[PDB]
Design a protein around this nucleic acid. Structure first.
Lengths: 247, 43, 46, 57
RNA sequence: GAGUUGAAAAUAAGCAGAGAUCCGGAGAUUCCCGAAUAGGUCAACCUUUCGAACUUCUGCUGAAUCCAUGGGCAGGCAAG
RNA sequence: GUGAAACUAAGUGGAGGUCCGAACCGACUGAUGUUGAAGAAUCAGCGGAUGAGUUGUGGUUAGGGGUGAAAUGCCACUCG
RNA sequence: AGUAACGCAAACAUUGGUGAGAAUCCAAUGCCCCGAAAACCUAAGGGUUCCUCCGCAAGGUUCGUCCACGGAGGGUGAGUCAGGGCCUAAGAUCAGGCCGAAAGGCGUAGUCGAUGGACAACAGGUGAAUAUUCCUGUACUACCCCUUGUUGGUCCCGAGGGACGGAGGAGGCUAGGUUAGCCGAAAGAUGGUUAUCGGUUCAAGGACGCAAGGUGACCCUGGGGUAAGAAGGGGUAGAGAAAAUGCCUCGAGCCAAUGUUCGAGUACCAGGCGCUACGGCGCUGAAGUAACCGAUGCCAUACUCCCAGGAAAAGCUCGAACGACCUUCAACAAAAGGGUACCUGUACCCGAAACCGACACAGGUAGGUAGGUAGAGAAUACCUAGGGGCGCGAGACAACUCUCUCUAAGGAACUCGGCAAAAUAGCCCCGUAACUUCGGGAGAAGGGGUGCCCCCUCACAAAGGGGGUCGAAGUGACCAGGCCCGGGCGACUGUUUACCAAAAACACAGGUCUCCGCAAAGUCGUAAGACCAUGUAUGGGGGCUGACGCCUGCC
RNA sequence: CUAUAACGGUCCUAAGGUAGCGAAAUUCCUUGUCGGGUAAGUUCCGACCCGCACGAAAGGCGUAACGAUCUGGGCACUGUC
């Protein structure tokens, strides 16, 4: 039964190839209306037990999103953790039971647990590990931070007084489904990316030469000319909150 | 054949439009019919 | 396929004359048909 | 496939928006065009249609 | 100072020494689009309680600290 | 048929960038045509034909720019 | 040079007209052609071409009395059909706001913008050009006017709903055709005949209105029986309204096209009898029923199955700060009683001689209707309905070019290459290999029958079995696969040089590398800022290789 | 036996082509030798190898299916001859 009053309809027209009309992000188009669902991240309804009445399939996302009622007349879509079988009960709050899929400030929870959704900073909805299976361990806490290890194999102290959810987001099985038809990609809305050794020298710094030609440049470059391997691209000074790249 | 199906004038969007009108109007009819029938039961 | 050079007035007058004259020969025939169609025994022209 | 014929029976209304006088005037450049089309001395200085009946016999 | 109702000839009735036609100074009207201006608009259109927005003037006077304000509201005039 | 399946036949089921083939889309072979009927057709054949399909009405992107399943092709018969 | 040509190989022929002039105009009679159209509408476009009467200078690839050409008059009527007065998507413009030599850029509420959602008309007549516009009859919507009541409003507001994917086959049906009855007429000059010919129609709307499918509820079937629950309904618990809770409801039926009746005791009509400058009209006017099959309409966003998960906002229905205002300005059951009813389009073409290709161009142009025989079919072939005979003709019939048919004996010997021809071909039935990813190959290959008549069986609707007869030839016309064996490249379907290149080129499913911690990286913009992402590390950008199998050395 | 070198010495670079494949869409000389096919085949298939100048993601090798692909030989069918 679609139309939860919450599928909220109007997205931004199609996939956004355009800032001004220009293709400013290459090769997007085609697909369905992929009509979107305002799921909840600013969870923020504290100390109210909600049910779980559906693991609904979200096209605008990667992980099955589950619906939750409440005692009041309220409904939300929130990502569902691994093993949130139907008709269970989750609850945000502060001292909440540590238990799959219920959120609690990051200060008040045991280190080493599996935590999926977090806040880089208060008020925002939910930023880090948020895909379809992603997980982040807590390494030891600290004065006003929490040396949290997000899902890049990468550690980063993050501000202790920000919300987070427990458990890991579910639906890991997507990570390995094969798209054999070769035009299913097209259903998803991702246009074919033409390789660059063939574009003529006006189009790409991989100018055509008689016969197949191997680069010939000192280093492989993006169509815009920057090195396309190894060249780290981080502003020299931004925050420096994170302890290690671990990349 | 053809003339006998452009006597009763209903084609591309007007077949669809009058059809929708008749579904609509009978739907209001039955809405009144059962709206009354309920009182026909509970007394 | 394309002519080299225009012909003179001389030549052209020759051929136009042959054209018209070719029309000349085909009158006296019609004049015989006339001078015979002036009422007379004949099986033609109902 | 139609022979290299550039113009097809497109709606007059659609054409008017692209080259419509109302459209022509709003742009800074467009007002400039009117300047010239009047300094030369043209008479039919657009191609438009009208939401009543775009013709007088 | 006599004849006149624009171009070309009638046409139809007119007007004029109880100044016609006409020539000047000052006026009045100046449908619709167009700065375009009541609102929209594919210009010369549609819907309209009949009449922009910017200054200006006269009044009501948000916010937080009923402060003071600016902003808003309105009735104004008519100047870009 | 095995504390448990694993597989064999039947039936239902209806999948497939599946199959043959009209509309439709497009262009491969051949002849005609080449002061053409046509500034790329006609005829006989030909490929795809529920899909990475077509198409209608409104729109978007611009000149060292746009778009490009990439030919430097297309951008109103004009494009290194 | 009076030279090529006169725009496709549908095809004209006559008699009689009109006129100064007929192959070219009109009327017959005949022949012929399309008929998934060379037919009838309609969106766009054109914009006066439509109609009537004169005209023929130029135009028409001939002619001309004729025209889409010239001249003069004339013509297109809507409360319901389309749009606006209603709503909003992509997009556009954006007050204020931010940014910027100037212009101007980004951007919110607003305002426009339909190709979409709300919303009310059908049949028959008329006529030179209009008719769902005019006329007749019957309908529907909105606003008033009248009566009884309640006094309580309308807005802003918070809610329901509007609201919406693809296939896929069932099911019930209706339009439509047949076949039959029924009524009318009939000799149609050769054998015999009526076995032949025509009509057999009526919509919107009102009132009633139900078998299918959905309760697979306990099963035997698909109905008596007993209790909670289905469509609809009352609640109460966190104050109207859904949102959530639980109980419960003479609760078991609800859903929809068809159906009936009225609309239509009516018209309508084949056929009769007179007029006539041969059209026309006049009066009469019978029967107006059943069985078959069938939809690429209808129930229908039924239902099942899928992943790639399918627009919004108004109308419209319920009510809180029962919000400004209050039976004087108000609204509802309501007589379904009486009256009124806003702008714009409407002609004509529209698979086109008038639209787009400069030509009255053997091109192109969205959507709608879809008949008969044979057929699996919207192909094909021959025809109804309707429309047309292609706007230069008549002779002769050399060579030669093209579109085609046939060719004795050989059957690739031609040739750069069997290119181009020819040849198979449909439905049944037997059989089907190498390989293989074990799906495929595979319609492999190859072989056989099939026409009509009679007969009984298997469903006993088709098909098959037996027998017969005919031709040289039996899917016999049209339509309708040539097939193998071996290689190279590319895994495949797909896309590409509009107009000399369709490919081994590009792409793709897959692989690896590398960058990016979320006010990311990358791109665009001087800037604001916008894609990225309303995503968030199994996710984003970039480079090369391109299923699958084994691998991927050394510096 | 004669040859071809299983194996050795030298300058060299940073090292000196591994597996597979091979006269190959890469071999010029070159219709390279040999075998099959043909009456006769510079095309063709299978091999050898002195790879002029193949070779491992400007991938190596091989692959069932598919090709309006290029290529060789077939049977049927014919005015292509």
């Amino acid at each position: 039964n679609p139309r939860n009053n919450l599928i909220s309809g109007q997205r931004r027209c199609g996939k956004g190839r355009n800032a001004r009309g220009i293709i400013t992000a290459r090769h997007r188009g085609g697909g369905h209306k992929r009509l979107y669902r305002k799921i909840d991240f600013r969870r923020n309804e504290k100390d109210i037990y909600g049910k779980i009445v559906t693991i609904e399939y979200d096209p605008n996302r990667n992980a099955y999103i589950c619906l939750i009622h409440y005692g009041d007349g309220e409904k939300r879509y929130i990502l569902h953790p691994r093993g949130a079988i139907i008709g269970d009960t989750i609850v945000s709050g502060t001292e909440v039971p540590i238990k799959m899929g219920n959120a609690l400030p990051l200060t008040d929870m045991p280190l080493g647990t599996a935590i999926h959704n977090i806040e880089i900073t208060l008020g925002r909805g939910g930023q880090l590990a948020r895909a379809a299976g992603a997980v982040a361990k807590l390494i030891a806490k600290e004065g006003k931070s929490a040396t949290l290890k997000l899902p890049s194999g990468e550690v980063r102290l993050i501000s202790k007084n920000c919300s987070a959810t427990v458990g890991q987001v579910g639906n890991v099985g997507v990570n390995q489904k094969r798209l054999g038809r070769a035009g299913s990609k097209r259903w998803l809305g991702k246009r074919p990316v033409v390789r660059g050794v063939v574009m003529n020298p006006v189009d790409h710094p991989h100018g055509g030469g008689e016969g197949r030609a191997p680069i010939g440049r000192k280093s492989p470059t993006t169509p815009w000319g920057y090195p396309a391997l190894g060249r780290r691209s981080r502003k020299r000074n931004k925050y420096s909150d994170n302890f290690i790249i671990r990349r | 054949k053809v003339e006998e199906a452009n006597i009763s004038v209903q084609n591309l969007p007007l077949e669809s439009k009058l059809q929708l009108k008749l579904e609509q109007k009978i739907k209001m009819k039955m809405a009144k019919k059962i709206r009354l029938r309920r009182t026909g039961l509970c007394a | 396929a394309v002519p080299k050079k225009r012909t003179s007035i001389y030549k052209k007058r020759i051929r136009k004359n042959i054209w018209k004259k070719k029309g000349y020969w085909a009158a006296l025939k019609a004049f015989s048909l006339a001078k015979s169609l002036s009422t007379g025994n004949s099986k033609s022209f109902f | 496939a139609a022979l290299c014929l550039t113009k097809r029976s497109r709606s007059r209304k659609s054409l008017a928006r692209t080259h419509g006088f109302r459209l022509r005037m709003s742009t800074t450049s467009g007002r400039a065009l009117l300047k010239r089309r009047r300094a030369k001395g043209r008479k039919i200085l657009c191609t438009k249609t009208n939401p009543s009946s775009g013709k007088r016999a």
